[PDB]
Design a protein around this ligand. Structure first.
Ligand code: SF4
Ligand code: SF4
Ligand code: SF4
Ligand code: SF4
Ligand code: FES
Ligand SMILES: [K+]
Ligand SMILES: [Zn+2]
Lengths: 129, 115, 87, 699, 48, 119, 96, 209
């Protein structure tokens, strides 16, 4: 139905040599994927709804001039977004970075009722509003 | 899934063929690019760099990837042949100003935090 | 010296492939430790592990022996042969 | 079952009866803007930003506290709902002072974000605003009460979570002020969390006060090591420097809270630190030097002495990877005195069984327990997050908590059985009435802390508690799967060490004194130079050299828990990973890399070279210490009970007193805490009185 | 300025300076911050 | 024109106190990221900058910082006559910015007085 | 106030002063360490404490729109002087 | 009027463009996958890659379509989707003045047939994509690198590629030439954490799962 001289190719993609990443950056660097935990200073939620990948932090020395934050690894302030973790891990393997996986932690739904603020015998009765 | 579309080569044999005359062209090129570009490289130490770069991507086994390396080397060949490239870019493969990098774990520990 | 210094057992939690060793330490372990109180029989139980046994003797050499589907008497023997060889 | 169908602006969802409206909306993904309702706190319906329009309903209802009913399409985006939000925020944002450039909440203010999303773009407030005088409530929380919105989150946190009911409201009307009336001293172990519950910059972090606008700091996840709880945290680092530590949500370890000790401990990293190797000069002073001669000296006199003459005492904040590396390095010379500061009775099963030294029922398991026995511990300071869990289960699940030992105040109304350890065996006998409770409780609970084990007769206490657990276990009241034995630790890197087979305590060194003692993070000072024989090569690794470092021959600087990428273990056995936030200062490297390089220089090279290989080797040692963020099911308790049960070691009559008895000593525990200055500031705040640490919060 | 007196204030310079670049009165950049993580001072008492 | 964008400078209040409260808005605004601030609770308390440096060689002279400033602390003076000889001479410091604001001050005050109504 | 370092360098208002060894002082030889004398720490202290008699006082920093955003400080605490966070003028009740 | 700030809404152009979208969808059902018109009256056609030449020709040649101007040609790398790269063709009509957009998808390796013949302006644009995203184009007349420096590597606009690149160049007297060196910044790019954690537009909310 889509005849274009199709060929079964079982082994996974090795686009590594195509990407141009240097050997030690494609080998030594370890990237982890995760859902970023929300800033506890905020109650907003729509920042833990994506799968972001980031790389291990490297040396950060202070230059002699003003004590700036000169670094050497270019892939330090590089974070990639992904809808589902499967896409992220596929990208990681096909690129060739050693990857680490953390499962999407989500808040457990707790039973909440205002009638618990008052009680006849339960300890849950509040003492101030 | 497993089924995919080729670029030119059908099987490892024909891509293996394409890298063959790519190395052909690089061999016949190296001496007269040394002559034309006034290279400080020598002929033998010109050829072995080509050989080592060809051996660098030894692990590749996907066909389409092999067509990609061969066409990129083709672009490299055009860039070199008609003097669009410059002598500095030709030297770029040879790492002169780049200081030698240690390999053993002990030297890595001595230098600084790095895997 | 070469006598064994600690004996480590890695048994799966529930999978039947590690069932036998689980029975072993269930009944044939308390008196085993009573026999050699000095000797560290470590049981680093975990999940989805093939039942495996490490034996560290001295100078940092370790011996590997699997216990895949080993019966209680069989794991008893595969411990006794190692323990008897106090060297 | 009972799931009732409820629409939200159209599409319908299945909702448990009794669920609030806002939770029903969250089931789909759209979120009510709120300021008064926190998911793990009581509801108050106070901010009135939770107002939303019910379809065919005259007046808007508050989604924070509204039991949803049949049908009830929640018109989240209705025009009336938008108007209600607009008006409620206009009221909220009238007396709010013009401090956004000067307030640390700037950029992550919540109020600012709601104004951006659901709010006006112009102010019609033509009158003067209201100003409230500041009330100082510590050197730990900056207080600008003119910015407050009276969302009452701080008060409810003080009442339920912390339990210290001192934070309240005063007055009425627009002049209502939330504070402490009296210039009181809010110094609970969970006070710092109020910084993260206050939506506005009314309460902030004094140590971090205006150090970085939070839109710059990169956030890196890691694990707290100040406590054996191993609370998940996030290090906020800008420009290669640690600014602050925030709690991460886990729901099994720390909810979303951390102790003040965990929170305000970064300043210890900036104080006294070890960066360059040092060796004793001709006069006996540690002078700075290159690495080469340091590893050369270590290699030479490690090569000279073999056998038991070489030792190593792992400290409290060490890493599991360097634990494995050091144990393997010391094994190649057959040295088998791998000791650690915290002592665990090795009589009987000892470290051989995971059930012996573990919070077997996990932290979450305490949320369904019925009765809990505390064997002479101070969990308010031994493990603040664990005590917070106990408090929440006491509040909601009417837990009946009792303890034996020191009469330390523990937020809730603990049932003080006594102080004498003799009561313990009476509980085993059953003559004590509390025994019946353990029989009657369907999920009974006994936990004995590591500090109470430290004492002098730890074997007797452990045997008595194990006998109690066995006595109640034979009863059918406890289910087959419900664990009973529980051991709570304090040192973060203890269980992991005990998992690796390190001999607990330091008694092995005292038995036959060594010569090449390898102090690895050891800072308790249990073993001093006097105990050791003459000419001992005390080698102190680590970061915060304050006790071990003065008594040393060669100093090997190490990496702190925010600089390495190693793993730790909580008191329940779950093995978590700490990622690298900032590079180690100066020339100090990681703790396992230095050990492996030392071994390679000395000749007995270890096989592993990068982090993945050392993790694989540690997997070879123990297969639970690689499996991350999941409690490895620990069992085989009964055979451990029948294993010890041989010695008597009659219990001393000394009352159980945990080393930490009052909030003043909760702060000054580890090397990191001692290095910190804010720790000293809060310690002196607690010691003398209220009027000693007032830091101006307006600027 | 004779007809429009600039508003005088204490912190204004009383002497204009041309660009001092080149001459040894030029400006040199330098970190205007305090120190980062501070070193641990070794003890002075003998080893024993 | 009074709107001319030139050398950056840090002004100060009539009392002599520097206007910068280190809100770091200008740092979050500069498209070239030429601005760097480190803040601190001062001895008096007012949150002034321990470090405030503008990399003039990175700066593209847009005037975004001044319009971002909520206290009109950072501004761009009318001076354009600061062609230097060394690259380090261009990299300004907090003290250099304060000196710029103390040298070109009547200029900046007069220009702001003639332009604040437009902006 | 500006004070000299033990080496001789002029300390800054932030407290920066290169130490004895401190190899990064060759930058200042044949040049000068540019320091501003008009210290903001002390140039705000000598300003008089305003004695305006009301409970809550507005402050824009002078100059109206040219000043800082209008903040309402509270002249309530009898034991200290209220001050605007932006400018720094100390406001106090006229001894009640 | 009542809405002086909100942009004017032109529904007539919207309906007319939707009619032409149904037209073009019916004409070429072989390659067309999904046609939709945006709120601001801009129609986009999502076609299968094999239709790069046919559909464009139908848009370039048909009497009732009459699009002969290649406004621009662009790729938009997005690593999430299975075929990361998506190519956008922008066409403008003269007889029936309007802007149409056709969008196709390809991964790093699967080649996408080169238009060139349909629009000889595409050529240089075409090269850019190959030199900027790695998307090789089948039988393109000269697919040499166009924009980046000589002997370059990678394809910079790929979202995985770092902002600062990998290697700079500078004078070296030891070899008396400009040399390429691995990256070592004097001051690292500070990556600010924007995008506040509060939902902005309820209309475009992603459905749950
Ligand atoms: S807390 Fe108040 S002053 Fe601070 S940013 Fe929020 S609204 Fe502005
Ligand atoms: S002080 Fe903060 S937490 Fe307490 S009521 Fe006011 S805004 Fe809420
Ligand atoms: S004009 Fe000012 S704010 Fe804009 S880039 Fe230059 S220094 Fe930064
Ligand atoms: S915007 Fe103005 S007040 Fe804020 S940091 Fe920059 S110069 Fe200072
Ligand atoms: S949620 Fe409705 S007021 Fe707090
Ligand atoms: K807050
Ligand atoms: Zn003011």
């Amino acid at each position: 139905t889509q005849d274009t001289q199709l060929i079964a190719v079982d082994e996974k993609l090795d686009i590594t040599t195509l990407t141009g990443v240097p050997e030690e950056h494609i080998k030594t660097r370890k990237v982890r994927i995760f859902v970023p935990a929300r800033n506890n200073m905020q109650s907003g939620v729509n920042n833990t709804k994506k799968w972001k990948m980031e790389f291990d932090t490297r040396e950060r020395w202070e230059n002699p001039l003003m004590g700036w934050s000169s670094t050497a690894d270019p892939l330090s302030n590089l974070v990639l977004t992904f809808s589902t973790k499967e896409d992220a891990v596929a990208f990681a393997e096909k690129n060739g970075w050693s990857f680490d996986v953390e499962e999407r932690k989500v808040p457990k739904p707790k039973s909440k009722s205002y009638g618990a603020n008052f009680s006849w015998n339960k300890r849950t009765r509040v003492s101030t509003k | 899934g497993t089924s995919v579309k080729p670029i030119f080569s059908r099987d490892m044999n024909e891509a293996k063929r394409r890298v063959r005359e790519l190395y052909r062209a690089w061999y016949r090129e190296v001496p007269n690019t040394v002559h034309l570009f006034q290279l400080d490289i020598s002929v033998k130490q010109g050829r072995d760099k080509v050989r080592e770069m060809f051996m660098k991507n030894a692990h590749v086994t996907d066909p389409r990837v092999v067509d990609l390396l061969v066409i990129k080397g083709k672009m490299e060949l055009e860039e070199t042949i008609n003097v669009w490239k410059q002598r500095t870019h030709i030297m770029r493969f040879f790492h002169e100003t780049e200081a030698p990098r240690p390999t053993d774990f002990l030297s890595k520990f001595y230098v600084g935090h790095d895997p | 010296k070469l006598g064994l210094r600690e004996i480590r057992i890695h048994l799966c939690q529930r999978s039947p492939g590690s069932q036998g060793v689980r029975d072993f330490i269930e009944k044939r372990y308390v008196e085993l430790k009573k026999a050699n109180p000095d000797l560290p029989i470590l049981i680093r139980e975990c999940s989805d592990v093939q039942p495996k046994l490490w034996a560290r003797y001295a100078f940092g050499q370790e011996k590997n022996v699997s216990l895949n589907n080993f019966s209680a008497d069989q794991v008893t023997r595969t411990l006794e042969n190692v323990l008897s060889g106090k060297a | 079952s009972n799931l009732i169908e409820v629409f939200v602006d159209g599409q319908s969802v299945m909702v448990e009866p009794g669920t609030t409206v806002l939770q029903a909306c969250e089931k789909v993904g759209m979120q009510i803007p709120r300021f008064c309702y926190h998911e793990r706190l009581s509801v108050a319906g106070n901010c009135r930003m939770c107002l939303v329009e019910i379809e065919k309903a005259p007046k808007v209802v508050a989604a924070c506290a509204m039991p949803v009913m049949k049908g009830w399409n929640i018109l989240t985006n209705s025009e009336k709902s938008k108007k209600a939000r607009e008006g409620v925020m206009e009221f909220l944002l009238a007396n709010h002072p013009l401090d956004c450039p000067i307030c640390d909440q700037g950029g992550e203010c919540d109020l600012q974000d709601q104004s951006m999303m659901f709010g006006s773009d112009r102010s019609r407030f033509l009158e003067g605003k209201r100003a409230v005088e500041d009330k100082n409530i510590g050197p730990l929380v900056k207080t600008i009460m003119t910015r407050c919105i009276q969302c009452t989150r701080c008060i409810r946190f003080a009442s339920e979570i912390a339990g210290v009911d001192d934070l309240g409201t005063t007055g009425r009307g627009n002049d209502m002020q939330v504070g402490t009336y009296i210039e009181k001293m809010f110094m609970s172990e969970l006070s710092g969390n109020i910084i993260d519950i206050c939506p506005v910059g009314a309460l902030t972090s004094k140590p971090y006060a205006f150090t970085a606008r939070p839109w710059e700091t990169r956030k890196t996840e890691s694990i707290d090591v100040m406590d054996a709880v191993g609370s998940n945290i996030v290090v906020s680092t800008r420009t290669g420097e640690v600014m602050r530590i925030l709690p991460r949500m886990h729901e099994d370890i720390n909810e979303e809270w951390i102790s003040d000790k965990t929170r305000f401990a970064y300043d210890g990293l900036k104080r006294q630190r070890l960066t360059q190797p040092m060796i004793r000069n001709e006069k006996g002073l540690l002078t700075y030097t290159t690495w080469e001669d340091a590893l050369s000296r270590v290699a030479g006199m490690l090569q000279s002495f073999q056998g038991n003459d070489v030792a190593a005492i792992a400290g409290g904040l060490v890493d599991a990877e360097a634990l494995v590396a050091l144990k393997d390095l010391l094994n190649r010379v057959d040295s088998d005195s791998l000791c650690t500061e915290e002592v665990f009775p090795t009589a009987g099963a000892g470290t051989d069984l995971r059930s012996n030294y573990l919070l077997n029922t996990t932290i979450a398991g305490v949320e369904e327990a019925d009765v809990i026995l505390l064997v002479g511990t101070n969990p308010r300071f031994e493990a603040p997050l664990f005590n917070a869990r106990i408090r929440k289960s006491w509040l909601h699940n009417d837990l009946k908590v009792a303890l034996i030992g020191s009469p330390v105040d523990l937020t809730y109304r603990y049932d003080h059985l006594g102080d004498s350890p003799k009561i313990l065996q009476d509980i085993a006998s059953g003559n004590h009435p509390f025994s019946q409770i353990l029989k009657e409780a369907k999920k009974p609970m006994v936990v004995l802390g590591s500090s109470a084990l430290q004492r002098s007769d730890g074997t007797a206490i452990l045997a008595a508690v194990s006998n109690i657990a066995q006595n109640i276990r034979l009863s059918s009241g406890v289910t087959g799967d419900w664990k009973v034995m529980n051991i709570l630790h304090r040192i973060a890197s203890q269980v992991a060490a005990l998992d690796l087979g390190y001999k607990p305590g330091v008694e092995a060194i005292r038995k036959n004194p060594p010569k090449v003692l390898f102090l690895l993070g050891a800072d308790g000072g249990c073993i001093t130079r006097q105990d050791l024989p003459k000419d001992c090569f005390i080698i102190y690794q680590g970061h915060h050299g304050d006790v071990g470092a003065p008594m040393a021959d060669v100093i090997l600087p190490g990496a702190a828990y925010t600089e390495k990428s190693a793993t730790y273990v909580n008191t329940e056995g779950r093995a978590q990973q700490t990622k690298v936030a900032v590079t180690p200062p100066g020339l100090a490297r990681e703790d396992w890399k230095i050990i492996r390089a030392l071994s390679e220089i000395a000749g007995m090279t270890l096989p592993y070279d990068t982090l993945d290989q050392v993790r694989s080797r540690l997997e070879e040692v123990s297969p639970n210490l690689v499996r991350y963020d999941d409690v490895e099911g620990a069992n085989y308790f009964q055979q451990a009970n029948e294993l010890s049960k041989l010695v008597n070691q009659q219990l001393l009559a000394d009352p159980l007193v945990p080393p930490q008895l009052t909030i003043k000593d909760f702060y000054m525990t580890d090397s990191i805490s001692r290095a910190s200055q804010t720790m000293a500031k809060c310690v002196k705040a607690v010691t003398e009185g209220i009027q000693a640490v007032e830091e101006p919060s307006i600027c | 300025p004779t007809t429009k007196p600039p508003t005088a204030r204490k912190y204004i310079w009383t002497n204009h300076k041309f660009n001092v670049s080149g001459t040894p009165q030029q400006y040199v950049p330098y970190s205007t911050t305090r120190k980062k993580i501070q070193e641990w001072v070794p003890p002075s008492t003998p080893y024993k | 024109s009074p709107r001319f964008r030139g050398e950056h400078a840090l002004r100060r209040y009539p009392s002599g106190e520097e206007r910068c409260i280190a809100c770091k808005l200008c740092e979050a605004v500069c498209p070239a990221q030429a601005i760097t601030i480190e803040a601190e609770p001062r001895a008096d308390g007012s949150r002034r900058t321990t470090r405030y440096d503008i990399d003039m060689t990175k700066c593209i002279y847009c005037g975004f910082c001044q319009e971002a400033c909520p206290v009109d602390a950072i501004v761009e003076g009318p001076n354009f006559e600061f062609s230097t000889e060394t690259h380090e001479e261009l990299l300004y410091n907090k003290e250099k910015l304060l000196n710029n604001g103390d040298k070109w001050e009547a200029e900046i005050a007069a220009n702001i007085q003639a332009d604040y109504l437009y902006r | 106030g500006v004070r000299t370092s033990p080496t001789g360098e002029k300390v800054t208002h932030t407290g920066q002063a290169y130490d004895d060894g401190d190899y990064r002082r060759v930058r200042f030889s044949d040049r000068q360490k540019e320091v501003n004398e008009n210290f903001a720490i002390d140039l705000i202290a000598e300003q008089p404490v305003s004695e305006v008699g009301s409970r809550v006082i507005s402050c824009d920093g002078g100059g109206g729109a040219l000043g800082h955003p209008r903040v309402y400080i509270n002249l309530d605490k009898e034991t200290k002087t209220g001050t605007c966070g932006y400018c720094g003028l100390q406001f106090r009740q006229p001894h009640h | 009027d009542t809405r002086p700030t909100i942009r004017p809404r032109n529904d007539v152009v919207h309906k007319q463009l939707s009619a032409f979208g149904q037209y073009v969808a019916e004409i070429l059902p072989k390659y067309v996958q999904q046609v939709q018109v945006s709120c601001f009256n801009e129609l986009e056609i999502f076609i299968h890659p094999d239709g790069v030449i046919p559909v464009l020709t139908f848009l370039r040649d048909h009497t009732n379509a009459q699009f002969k101007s290649l406004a621009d040609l662009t790729a938009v790398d997005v690593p999430t989707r299975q075929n990361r790269f998506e190519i956008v063709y922008n066409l403008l009509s003269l007889r029936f003045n309007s802007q149409i957009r056709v969008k196709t998808y390809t991964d790093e390796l699967t080649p996408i047939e080169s238009s060139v013949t349909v629009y000889k302006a595409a050529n240089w644009y075409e090269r850019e994509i190959w030199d900027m995203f790695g998307v090789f184009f089948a039988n393109h007349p000269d697919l040499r690198r166009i924009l980046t420096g000589y002997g370059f590597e990678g394809h910079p606009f790929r979202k995985d590629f770092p902002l600062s690149g990998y290697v700079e160049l500078r004078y070296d007297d030891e070899v008396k030439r400009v040399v390429a060196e691995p990256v070592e910044l004097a001051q690292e790019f500070r990556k600010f954490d924007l995008n506040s954690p509060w939902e902005a537009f309820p209309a475009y909310r992603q459905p749950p799962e």
